[PDB]
């Protein structure tokens, strides 16, 4: 029914590992850039 | 000019010559004797044309019009009593019946039961309706044109 | 955009022609800082206080003359390239934006 059966699964393994690795890396990077806005502080100083 | 070109193009998508060529089939009633059901090929699906004897047409009248799922007496189905023309497909899940047999002498769908009388009506079985009756008519006491 | 651009040029593609001229400008500059008694006194007070002694124009000039393209590039790279700068903005500054974008202007000529 589906000869690819084995190669398909072996591929799923490779996909998970890489997926795990890449997703973590990209999460860090997303965070690193946004850090600037996430920690940002503001104040309202009218000539009051 | 526009009306024409559009007309031509639009129409290029409707049925082509080869397809219309099988649009309808003409059967010769002379080849079909009484008491013998003859099936032909129409639109890829079996077409039933049985010659009903004066005897079978009787068993027909003896049918409680209000005791059948798809309530219809021969009157509403055919035209010429000695002639019954059905679309050979069980109304349940598209199977092709078997004539002469069954609990009502008509047709029997060996798929889930569905027994049809001599007039092609669902009697005993799962089928919801009765074998379909397609458009047609006659031409000379020997030809019929279904479709 | 253009400004940061010039800094990147300093680190990556300075020309002898540019330094040659830059040096003449800088000389006339140091000299112009000793044009009067107050400005020469300001120099003395400061030099001692900062370098722990006086540095004569004769010296400044010796050092300034040793500077060349290759040198300017190495120094600027060392102090500017890929650094995270400090930014101060005042006024109708809506069009200047994102520290991130500015930080990225700190590399690749």
């Amino acid at each position: 029914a589906e000869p690819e059966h084995d190669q398909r699964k072996r591929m799923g393994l490779k996909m998970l590992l890489i997926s795990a690795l890449l997703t973590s890396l990209l999460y860090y990077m997303k965070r690193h850039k946004w850090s600037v806005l996430k920690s940002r502080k503001m104040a309202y100083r009218p000539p009051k | 000019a526009a009306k024409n070109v559009v007309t031509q193009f639009i129409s290029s998508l409707s049925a082509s010559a080869d397809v219309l060529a099988l649009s309808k089939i003409e059967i010769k009633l002379s080849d079909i004797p009484e008491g013998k059901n003859v099936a032909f090929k129409w639109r890829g699906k079996p077409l039933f044309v049985r010659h009903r004897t004066q005897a079978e047409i009787n068993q027909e009248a003896e049918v409680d019009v209000s005791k059948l799922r798809d309530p219809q007496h021969d009157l509403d189905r055919v035209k010429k009593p000695e002639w019954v023309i059905l679309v050979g497909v069980c109304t349940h899940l598209g199977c092709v019946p078997i004539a002469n047999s069954g609990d009502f002498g008509g047709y029997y769908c060996p798929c889930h039961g569905s027994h049809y009388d001599a007039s092609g009506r669902i009697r005993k079985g799962p089928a919801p309706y009765n074998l379909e009756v397609p458009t047609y008519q006659f031409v000379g006491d020997d030809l019929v044109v279904v479709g | 955009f253009c400004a940061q651009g010039e800094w990147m040029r300093l680190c990556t593609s300075t020309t002898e022609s540019e330094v040659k001229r830059a040096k003449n400008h800088l000389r006339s500059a140091m000299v112009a800082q000793l044009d009067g008694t107050t400005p020469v006194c300001e120099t003395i007070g400061s030099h001692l206080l900062n370098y722990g002694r006086r540095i004569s124009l004769e010296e400044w000039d010796s050092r300034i003359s040793a500077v060349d393209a290759r040198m300017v590039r190495d120094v600027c790279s060392k102090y500017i390239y890929d650094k995270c700068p400090a930014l101060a903005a005042v006024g109708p500054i809506e069009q200047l934006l994102d520290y991130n974008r500015i930080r990225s202007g700190m590399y690749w000529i």
């Binding site: 806005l37 996430k38 940002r40 503001m42 309202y44 009218p46 | - | -």
Partner: protein
């Protein structure tokens, strides 16, 4: 009795814009009337609304809210724009009605 009041004060907390330090009028969708009304606000009320709003946006991106102490209280919410907005609509309805006649 004080039913209507109980309800309103309830919904006011239910909504929760005050957790962002916003006044009810800060949350209005800016259609045409509201846009004109905002143009009439005095310089000071305008910059105040502006900060309140920019503050809320920063809280939103941060996925935070203000400490319970800083939450606008039902009875201390200033309907700063309602007065202007109502007139703007009155003026519009005058015109609309007059151009029909």
């Amino acid at each position: 009795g004080r039913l209507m009041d109980r309800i309103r004060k309830w919904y006011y907390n239910a909504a929760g814009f005050n957790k962002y330090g916003l006044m009810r009028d800060d949350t209005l969708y800016e259609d045409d009337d509201v846009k004109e009304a905002l143009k009439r606000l005095p310089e000071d009320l305008y910059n105040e609304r502006m900060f309140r709003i920019k503050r809320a946006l920063d809280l939103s991106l941060k996925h935070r809210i203000l400490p319970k102490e800083q939450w606008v209280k039902y009875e201390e919410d200033k309907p700063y724009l309602e007065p202007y907005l109502k007139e703007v609509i009155r003026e519009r309805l005058e015109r609309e009605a007059w151009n029909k006649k």
